[PDB]
Design a binder for this molecule. Structure first.
Ligand SMILES: Cc1ncc(COP(=O)(O)O)c(CNCC(=O)O)c1O
Ligand SMILES: Cc1ncc(COP(=O)(O)O)c(CNCC(=O)O)c1O
Lengths: 399, 399
């Protein structure tokens, strides 16, 4: 046995253990555009209830047409980072429009929200500084923090008292600048960070407040500006990182939105911005069309909150443990990972497309289906899916 | 004076410090698609010699048309990670086509090569293991390694004796598995890793061999398959990370190519694959077309080789320290940062678009112009470029 082939055996052993634990993820091959209804390669049409396509913009024909026109005017790829020959007029326009949309001075585009978080903390903070994360922060945030030299603190999920505890220990530890950072809306449980309280706590200690808005931008808040609008702290946020790949088009891209001087240091120093490709022209162009759509009417936002309020009441009535208000992320807890695999595959047989969340995506013993509402869903599909959840929820002992 | 505002003052001071040092980067706003000639929003049309558009596919009409078709048949965004509802038949087809193109059993798509590198080492290696890196490895590789718990060794740039020294030490320090990782072609100086020697040196120690192929795929090797083809080690590479945003279209996306079990574990466990958007349908479809073009004929990479040997030989006869031929990346050292921005500015006035390279993109005191060849250039442009380089070169003291 050679070391290299030994290595491949440890990999194959690891892959076999993951199956045995029921934790192996199987990809489903979709044959159609993203949509509230979708078809797999077997030709079966099913209701998609697990997409980040909150506002239906992923296949919106005006967004689609703006991609066609940006290809015509501005080409397919740029094959360059921003500071060389990857900045088109489109990127500057989109950054201006996102900053106005979000209430910030400026905005810097990244290839993904993952890389915005990746290149944020190491650029702005040093060994003398502290970052203090909600314990449930998205993986991209944790890895961005791990790449920084900052001192790290974690506070219990949504626990404003533990947040005060950590800011005390961080100040005691001699922190110079302190950044409190959290998902605006949490990926896996739908809860909404208490930004109004956190803005107050931050001011008291003099800490910066940064949020990750991937699951808020476009629909949270009366005008879909984000969690900070819904919490009454619009214009009061130090750092917004976010994605173009959820409600704002779904294709690719991310951003950091902040005061002008923060954004300016990120262009000069942030590693993903210096060393990774610019957002593709058709993407930037369609994102500008997305902002025109959402600033013209809150209808899509309102429709989402409506469908959500409907489908949440529905799951309440059936005996599922869902709070039943608004929150387009409806986490249906099943704890056991094998149950989650069963429920996902039973619901697929009854014409509903959802997917099992289990470790390492969610913690062990806390498996779940993450149901995700879209503004696309019509009452027929909504009522249809409730029947599939009621039936499958009874066949497998959940209600 | 509040802590928050003092932080912003720090950022402002640092920006100012960057500008005083001659290290502040200013983006130029291009109003046109990417191509051999380009026009900025001030109307001036100029010769582009600093794109990653090595094969000219960034605005190739068949690549633009495939992206058009994919928008029609498969939509704009998927707004989902792969294991949920972000997998279309296109992603499976491109992963298959790429594996065949590169000589590997399977491929896993990422949002970028930056993320492919970011999600590799932490998923495959542990604290018991070792990574040995060429000292000039790309920032994305260093960042991926930093995120893993493996022990880190560096060998001197392209120094095969030092690599053996590190392989001994890593063995003497008790490494379980050892992965030797390197740029295929190096970002900032165009040198080509000595994969033939390294595959042999790796084999002595049973170390793995991994390569970052961003500046190679499409055009390195007789059939353009990679640096490994060019060194006669095709099919003998444990790990290939690489991009779709350079020679292969220039829009977005990246990949890791490896044996079936590595790729399978990357799907199960790689954080950017789990937690960041799938590649957009238009980019995957246009990528499948890109491989159709490059597998039908070698003319584009052949015209790239010609354009390079002509231009490298031309700058040599002009007195530039440039050397030989065949390396599409032509570094032109100026050392001083100011001299780098001046040279780039003077070349713009003479009708050539290049950009100064300086810290932190390259080391302090080692500023350069990174000329980059494309297959797109006619000899009238390459000749007008040479005249522009001879004039600006002798005006600023370079020749
Ligand atoms: C060696 C290397 N690796 C990874 C990346 C990241 O690629 P993506 O664009 O796919 O993230 C780059 C980008 N380098 C761009 C340049 O040299 O200008 C690179 O040069
Ligand atoms: C809070 C949060 N932050 C960052 C990211 C990364 O975004 P990009 O896809 O732009 O890299 C995600 C992805 N979330 C995927 C999901 O919830 O299924 C997220 O949920």
């Amino acid at each position: 046995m050679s070391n290299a082939e030994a290595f491949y055996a440890s990999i194959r052993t690891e892959l076999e253990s993951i199956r045995a634990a029921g934790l192996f993820k199987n990809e489903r091959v979709i044959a159609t555009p993203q949509g509230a209804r979708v078809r797999t390669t077997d030709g079966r049409e099913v209701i998609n209830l697990c997409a980040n396509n909150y506002l239906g913009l992923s296949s919106h024909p005006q967004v689609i047409e703006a991609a066609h026109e940006a290809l015509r005017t501005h080409g397919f790829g740029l094959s360059s980072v921003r500071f060389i020959c990857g900045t088109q007029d489109l990127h500057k326009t989109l950054e201006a429009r996102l900053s106005a949309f979000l209430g910030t001075e400026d905005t810097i585009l990244y290839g993904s929200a993952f890389d915005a978080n990746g290149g944020l903390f190491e650029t702005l903070l040093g060994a003398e500084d502290a970052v203090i994360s909600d314990a449930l922060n998205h993986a991209s945030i944790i890895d961005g923090v791990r790449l920084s030299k900052a001192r790290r603190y974690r506070y219990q999920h949504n626990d404003m008292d533990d947040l005060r505890v950590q800011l005390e220990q961080a100040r005691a530890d001699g922190a110079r600048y302190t950044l409190v950072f959290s998902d605006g809306v949490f990926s896996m449980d739908g809860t909404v960070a208490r930004l109004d309280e956190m803005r107050a706590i931050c001011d008291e200690y003099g800490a910066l407040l940064g949020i990750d808005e991937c699951h808020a931008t476009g629909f949270m808040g009366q005008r879909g500006r984000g969690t900070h609008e819904a919490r009454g702290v619009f214009g009061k946020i130090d750092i917004i990182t976010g994605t173009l790949g959820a409600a704002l088009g779904g294709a690719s891209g991310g951003f950091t939105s902040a005061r002008k001087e923060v954004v300016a240091l990120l262009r000069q120093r942030s590693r993903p911005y210096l060393f990774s490709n610019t957002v593709a022209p058709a993407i930037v162009g369609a994102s500008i069309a997305v902002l025109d759509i959402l600033e013209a009417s809150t209808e899509l936002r309102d429709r989402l909150e409506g469908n959500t309020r409907f489908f949440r009441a529905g799951l309440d009535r059936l005996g599922f443990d869902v709070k039943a208000g608004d929150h387009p992320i409806i986490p249906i807890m099943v704890y056991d990972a094998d149950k989650a695999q069963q429920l996902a595959q039973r619901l697929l047989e009854l014409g509903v497309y959802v997917v099992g969340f289990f470790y390492p995506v969610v913690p062990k013993g806390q498996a779940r289906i993450r149901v995700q509402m879209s503004a696309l869903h019509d009452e027929a599909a909504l009522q249809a899916a409730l029947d599939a959840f009621g039936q499958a929820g009874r066949e497998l002992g959940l209600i």
